[PDB]
Design a protein around this ligand. Structure first.
Ligand SMILES: O=P(O)(O)O[C@H]1[C@H](OP(=O)(O)O)[C@@H](OP(=O)(O)O)[C@H](OP(=O)(O)O)[C@@H](OP(=O)(O)O)[C@H]1OP(=O)(O)O
Ligand SMILES: O=P(O)(O)O[C@H]1[C@H](OP(=O)(O)O)[C@@H](OP(=O)(O)O)[C@H](OP(=O)(O)O)[C@@H](OP(=O)(O)O)[C@H]1OP(=O)(O)O
Ligand SMILES: [Cl-]
Lengths: 314, 313
């Protein structure tokens, strides 16, 4: 009769103590002018990726895309964010937000974007946003005037090479965003899994009070899973008359992940990802249902509450 | 007036520029014994070409059978048990694990690790007391915590390795005692000539040893620091042997060659050149100390004698 973890909360069954952070991972090498996977809702649609087995002939509706005003990308250096901000300012006169979707603790050491990485990038798994940000604040401050090892991950998601330096400057992403002329909003979402009801309730309350001309620049570490999930959510919220298929196809075709059904295939070492991919597919459909069934009364019922009374099925 | 005398060049380096940043894997535990394992009873081998020595020269082995010393790289607990068993076949006296490492090190879940800073100088400038306090604190702090242990690869930076939540922490003293060996620590900085403090400590220790004591010296690789102390011991115990014979024989049983040779390093290792030169001069100065002070029973320590008889570059 009693279910321990409902669909949409599978990650709650994992043990945080088994994925604690152990290294400052390099989030971006700063070689390119812009972060990776940079895209906006004003962009032209491209051919779908073969791995998703989609209909390349299909022409998704672009209804509402010109007025959507959102973008997404991977993590960035401060110089890259300034370049992003400049580009977005050519598209709007409203406030531009850096919507940081990363639960992992991260920041900038001597201007270098880094994150405290644990296995599966789950160093803050299970923490409330309050606890995750306290960890981040503590770790960043502790790095000042201290020697740190910053490294990119290579074979088997372990450090490979990198550099050692005695830190002279520490900055939070909020500071870097403000320096780039962007407003900042943080949603502490766990890497690789469906955002939690807490994450989404927070996002919806934030969305509700945005000025009509607000531009949302979403980002995560790679600019794929989490970034696309929130871009899809925003598209659905702002353009409720658009079909689920059109939303999923167009968010994929401008450069994001495809959040519909597809032949999931993983290497043996990544088999743990499989059920999380299936969970996101089911939850994307359930969020669409939430939008359709609650927009009429102006979303009086929060997503978390509605989901508990309308649980998703595997 | 000179700021730093010969033999103390490392004192000019800045400790803050070489602080520890990773738990380095000291030995992968694949072999039964530590690397560069050798004993004074071993046969002499041909010299290594890089030292440009006379391969036809046969040094005297006078005193080697009674010297009773050995050397090696760092080891896993199992490898040390293997070493202890081997050495017990050669003596009925106490067998000492003479740990020559200044860098903080120990065992996490039985894995030999050290807190590595650039040039392995994470404890540079610390007194032995401070180095050992750092070591105790860091080891204790790892218990029940997640750590990243990695071997060094390209450019002396971590490559691969493993991540684990530590369930057991031990100091090398505990591991040595569990293997049936006595333990003595000399906190010598990697890559440079041991300090007057290091050497005064070693000589006072040497003076306390019973006739049948066996000394197993080790450092990280079992090369620079290990050979320096093996050479010192050979000179102390066999003062009638020529400097050339001591240096050749300690090299030919498997150690570094501490005499003059044409030094050539990779460009990235050019900082080592003067430290190699310094060791050559200091080895000669230590030989002089032994020859001049053995007759009266070492009434005056090395540090004092060296201050009144400074070495010259
Ligand atoms: O930067 P990468 O090494 O390329 O890793 C990314 C990144 O996550 P991590 O960097 O922390 O491993 C993606 O996610 P977001 O940070 O944008 O949320 C993730 O997206 P999903 O796991 O949710 O799909 C993606 O996975 P994908 O293979 O689908 O691109 C994954 O790539 P890899 O781990 O396979 O390199
Ligand atoms: O374990 P390794 O990677 O082989 O390094 C060793 C080790 O020092 P490190 O491990 O910290 O680099 C030697 O020293 P001891 O620990 O036994 O004192 C050192 O000896 P010296 O620097 O004093 O000479 C030797 O140098 P080498 O064998 O070239 O003489 C060096 O080897 P590499 O740095 O070349 O790998
Ligand atoms: Cl005196």
């Amino acid at each position: 009769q009693t279910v321990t973890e409902p669909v949409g909360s599978y990650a709650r069954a994992e043990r945080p103590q088994d994925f604690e952070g152990f290294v400052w991972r390099l989030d971006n090498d700063g070689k390119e002018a812009l972060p990776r996977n940079f895209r906006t809702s004003a962009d032209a649609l491209r051919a779908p990726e073969k791995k998703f087995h989609l209909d390349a002939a299909y022409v998704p509706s672009r209804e509402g895309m010109d007025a959507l005003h959102i973008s997404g990308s991977s993590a960035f250096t401060p110089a890259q964010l300034k370049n992003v901000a400049a580009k977005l300012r050519e598209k709007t006169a409203g406030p531009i937000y850096d919507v940081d979707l990363r639960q992992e603790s991260h920041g900038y050491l001597d201007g270098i974007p880094v994150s405290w990485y644990g296995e599966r990038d789950w160093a803050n798994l299970g923490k409330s946003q309050h606890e995750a940000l306290a960890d981040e604040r503590h770790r960043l401050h502790a790095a000042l005037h201290k020697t740190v090892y910053i490294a990119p991950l290579g074979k088997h998601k372990l450090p490979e090479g990198g550099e050692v330096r005695r830190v002279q400057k520490v900055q939070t992403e909020q500071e870097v965003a403000e320096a780039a002329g962007m407003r900042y909003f943080r949603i502490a979402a766990t890497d690789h899994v469906w955002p939690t009801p807490e994450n989404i309730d927070r996002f919806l309350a934030f969305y509700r009070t945005l000025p009509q001309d607000a531009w949302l620049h979403f980002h995560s570490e790679a600019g794929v899973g989490r970034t696309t999930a929130f871009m899809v959510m925003t598209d659905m919220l702002k353009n409720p008359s658009v079909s689920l298929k059109d939303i999923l196809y167009r968010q994929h075709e401008i450069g994001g992940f495809y959040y519909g059904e597809f032949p999931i295939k993983t290497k043996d070492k990544d088999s743990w990802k499989t059920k999380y991919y299936r969970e996101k597919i089911v939850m994307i459909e359930q969020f669409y249902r939430y939008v359709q069934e609650n927009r009429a009364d102006g979303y009086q019922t929060p997503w978390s509450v509605w989901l508990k009374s309308h649980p998703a099925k595997a």
